[PDB]
C-alpha cells in the first residue's frame, strides 16, 4: 500500500511549461502529458512536461492522440534523450484544484496502464508569488468506500501538513482522490543564472536624469507640499478633542496630511540624493 | 558568600549582550 507520504519531485522547468500552456489558452481547460522517470514506490520525479494540442471548441479534456504521443514520444528518443510517460495534467483555470467527474474518467483511463499515474491541476490565476495552486491528486478506490475502510495507513507525519480547501472538500478530493505533498528541485546551476539576469541595469544610474527637469520636478512636488503642510497646519489643531479612534473612523472621506506628507519626503529625498551622487562620480571618472 | 556576586553578575552580561543583536536582526527581518 501507500503511507500517504508520497513526496513528488518535479523540476524547475515543468512548472514553467504548466504556467505557459495553462496561461496561453487559459479560459479553456487545456491539458497535456507528463514525461518523467518513475522512481520507487513512494516518490515520483517528473523531469519533463510536453503539451498536447486541443481537439475542438469547448472547455474539456476531450481525448488523447496516440499518433501524437507516439510520434512525440519517439521524437525525443532520436533527438534528445529517452524518458518515460508517468502522468498527465489538465488546468482548472480560475477555480483552484479538484477532480471533476470528467477529469476522474480520463484519470481512470490513465491509472489502468500504470497504477501510479498522477492527476495534476494547475491554476494560473489565483497564483501570485508564493501560491501556484497545483496539489497533485490521485484516485482512491470507491470499493473501499463501500467497505467503509479508511485507506493509506499513515506511517509518517508528512502528508497531513497542508490543509485541504473547503471548495475541494465540496468535491471528491478524498472520497475519490487524495492530495500529495510536493516540493521543487533546484540547484546553484539554475539559481545564479536566473538571479543575475532578471532585473539588471546597464549604465542607467550613470546618467543625469533629464537635467533641466530634475529641478523642475523638485518644485513640482514642493509646491503642493506647501498646501499639504497647510493641511498639516490644519489637522493637528483639532487634537485634545474627541478621542483618536473617532479620528480613525472619521477620516475615511478626506485625505490626511500625515502619511501623504512623509510620502513626499521620501520621494523628494530619493529623487535628489541619487542624482546628486551620480552627478559627482562622473567628474572623477571622466577626466 | 560574596565571591559569587560578580562572576554570577557577569554571566548575565554574557547572556545580556546577545539580546539587542537578536532583536536588532528582527528589526529588518520583519520588514523582509
Amino acid at each position: 500500500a501507500v503511507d500517504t507520504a508520497e513526496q513528488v519531485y518535479i523540476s524547475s522547468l515543468a512548472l514553467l511549461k504548466m504556467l505557459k500552456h495553462g496561461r496561453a489558452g487559459v479560459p479553456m481547460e487545456v491539458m497535456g502529458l507528463m514525461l518523467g522517470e518513475f522512481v520507487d514506490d513512494y516518490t515520483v520525479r517528473v523531469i519533463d512536461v510536453f503539451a498536447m494540442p486541443q481537439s475542438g471548441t469547448g472547455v474539456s479534456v476531450e481525448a488523447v492522440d496516440p499518433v501524437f504521443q507516439a510520434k512525440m514520444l519517439d521524437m525525443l528518443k532520436q533527438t534528445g534523450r529517452p524518458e518515460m510517460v508517468v502522468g498527465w495534467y489538465h488546468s482548472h483555470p480560475g477555480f483552484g484544484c479538484w477532480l471533476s467527474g470528467v477529469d476522474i474518467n480520463t484519470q481512470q483511463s490513465f491509472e489502468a496502464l500504470s497504477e501510479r499515474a498522477v492527476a495534476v491541476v494547475v491554476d494560473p490565476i489565483q497564483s501570485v508569488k508564493g501560491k501556484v495552486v497545483i496539489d497533485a491528486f490521485r484516485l482512491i478506490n470507491a470499493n473501499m468506500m463501500v467497505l467503509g475502510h479508511e485507506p493509506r495507513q499513515t506511517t509518517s507525519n508528512l502528508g497531513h501538513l497542508n490543509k485541504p480547501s473547503i471548495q475541494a472538500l465540496i468535491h471528491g478530493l478524498n472520497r475519490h482522490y487524495y492530495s500529495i505533498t510536493i516540493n521543487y528541485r533546484k540547484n546553484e546551476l539554475e539559481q545564479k543564472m536566473l538571479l543575475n539576469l532578471h532585473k539588471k541595469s546597464w549604465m542607467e544610474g550613470l546618467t543625469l536624469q533629464d537635467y533641466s527637469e530634475h529641478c523642475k520636478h523638485n518644485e513640482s512636488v514642493v509646491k503642493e507640499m506647501l498646501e499639504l503642510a497647510k493641511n498639516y497646519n490644519k489637522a493637528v489643531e483639532e487634537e485634545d478633542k474627541m478621542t483618536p479612534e473617532q479620528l480613525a473612523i472619521k477620516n475615511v472621506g478626506k485625505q490626511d496630511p500625515k502619511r501623504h506628507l512623509e510620502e513626499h519626503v521620501d520621494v523628494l529625498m530619493t529623487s535628489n540624493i541619487v542624482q546628486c551622487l551620480a552627478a559627482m562620480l562622473d567628474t572623477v571618472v571622466f577626466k | 558568600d560574596l565571591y559569587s556576586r560578580y562572576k554570577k553578575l557577569q554571566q548575565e552580561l554574557e547572556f545580556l549582550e546577545v539580546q539587542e543583536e537578536y532583536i536588532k536582526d528582527e528589526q529588518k527581518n520583519l520588514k523582509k
Binding site: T43, E150 | E14
Partner: protein, 548 residues
Amino acid sequence: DQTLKMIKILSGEMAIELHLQFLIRNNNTDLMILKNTKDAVRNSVCHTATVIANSFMHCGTTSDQFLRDNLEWLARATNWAKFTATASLGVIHKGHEKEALQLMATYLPKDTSPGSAYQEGGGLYALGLIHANHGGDIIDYLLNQLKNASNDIVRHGGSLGLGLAAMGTARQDVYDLLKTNLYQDDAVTGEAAGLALGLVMLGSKNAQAIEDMVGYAQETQHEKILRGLAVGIALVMYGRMEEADALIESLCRDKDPILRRSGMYTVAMAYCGSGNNKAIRRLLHVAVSDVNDDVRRAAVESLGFILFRTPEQCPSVVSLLSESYNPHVRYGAAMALGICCAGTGNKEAINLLEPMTNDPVNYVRQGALIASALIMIQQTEITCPKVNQFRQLYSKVINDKHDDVMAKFGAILAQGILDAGGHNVTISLQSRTGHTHMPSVVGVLVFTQFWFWFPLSHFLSLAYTPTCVIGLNKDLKMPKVQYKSNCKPSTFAYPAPLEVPPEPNFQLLDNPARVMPAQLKVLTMPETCRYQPFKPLSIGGIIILKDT
C-alpha cells in the same frame, strides 16, 4: 568476590534485572484508560496510537494483557501496524534475556510465514530494543541473519536493532554489513543504514567515516538516505566544544537545507548541556536567517539540548519565541520547553504552554500536548496543580469527534507518556554527579523525529529511568529496612483510578521503594532498625545497607 567483581560491576546485571524486579513488583496502571481510548475504532493512526501508548506506559514490565485482550482490533491495521505491533513488544520485555526469543517464537520469519513480512520482519527491531547497550549473542544473532535476508523490510529492524545493541561500540563487524547496507543505492535502506552507522560510531569522530558519510550524502537522489545520514553525522561526534565547528560551518555553508539542519543537530550534539557563547551565536542566528522550516525547527530545538544544565534560563528566551510568525518556530519553541524543563514541574514553563494549545495549527496543538506531558511525569497535584487540570484535558481532546487525528495524537501519545511504568520510570538526561545520561540524550534526540518515521520515536525506552532506592547487604540478599519521612505527606500521592462501572508521615518503605527525587531530602534515615547505611543517603539507586 574480587575475581567476580568485574562481572558484578561492569556487566551490571544486578541493576538491570533488579530494576526489572522493581517493575515486576511495582505496577500501578489501568485498563479503563485504554477502554476509554478504545471507542475511536477507525483505520487511521489510532491503532498504532494505542499500541504505541501501552508500550509507552508498560516499559519493561512484561505485561501482555493489554495486547492479548483481542486479536482483530490489534491486527486490523496493516503493512506497518504489524511492524509496529512486533516493534512494541520488546519495550514491554525490555532488559530481560529469557522472554525475548521464546514469546516471539511465533514471530520468527521462518516459522509462520504470513502474507505480512513486517510482522515477522520487525522483530529484530524489538530484539535491539530489549538489549540496547547489552552486547552478546544479540550482535552476531542480529548479524548472521543480516548477512542473508530479504530486502529492506527485515533489514530495517535488524539494522536499527543491531546498531542499537551495538550503540557506541565501534565494531568493525557491524560496520561491515552497514557499509553494504549503505551503498545499496536505495531509498528504503536510508533509515536502515544511516542511523545505525552513527549509532555504532557514537562519540568516535572517525573522520574517514565522516568523509564516507557526508561524501556519500552529496550525489544520491533520494531523501531517506539524505536523512538517516543527516542524524548519523550528528551522532558520530558527541560533546566536543570546539572539534566540530569547521564541520558546522561546512554543513551550514552548503545550499542543502537538510545538511544545514544536520549541522544544527551536529552543533546540538557537540555542545550537550554546554553554556558556550560561540555556538549560540550562529545557532540562534541561523534560526533567524534560514528560510527552510525544518532547519528552523531543529535550530530552535537545539536550545534545551545545549542548555538543559540550567532549566531556569530557557523560559526567558523561548517564551520570546512562542509567538513567532510561523507554526514551525512556534512548534519547535514548545518542544524546546519540553526538552529543557521536562525533569522539573516548571510552573513558569506550564504558564508558557497554557495558551499553546489554542493556536489554530494542529501540530503546535499536538506538541503543546507532548511538552505538556513531558513537563509533569510522576507529579501528583502538589509540585504544580495543573496535572489534574490536564488529565481532563487529554480526555477532553481525545473524546471529541470533530478534532484532528494529529491533534488528538498528542493526547493518546501523552497517555502512554504520562502513565509510564506505573509512575516508576522517569526521564533523566542528567545524573547527580554532573554527567549527562547519554542514552537518554540520544533517546530524546532520536525521539524528536516522529515526523518522518513513526516508530523512530519508539526509541524512547533508553530515556525511561527509575526513581527507586534499593537496599543491599550481600551480593544477593535483600535486607529488611523500614524508614520514614518528615515533611508534608500528601507529596506521596498516587494515581488512584476511579473505577466507575489524622495523617501519617511515617511512610514505611521496603527495599524496592519508589520515591521522588524531591522526596530524597524529606525522608528519615533508618536509626532504629537493625540495618544502618554506611553511605549518607542522598542518591537513589542501589546502596550497601550495613547490618549493624
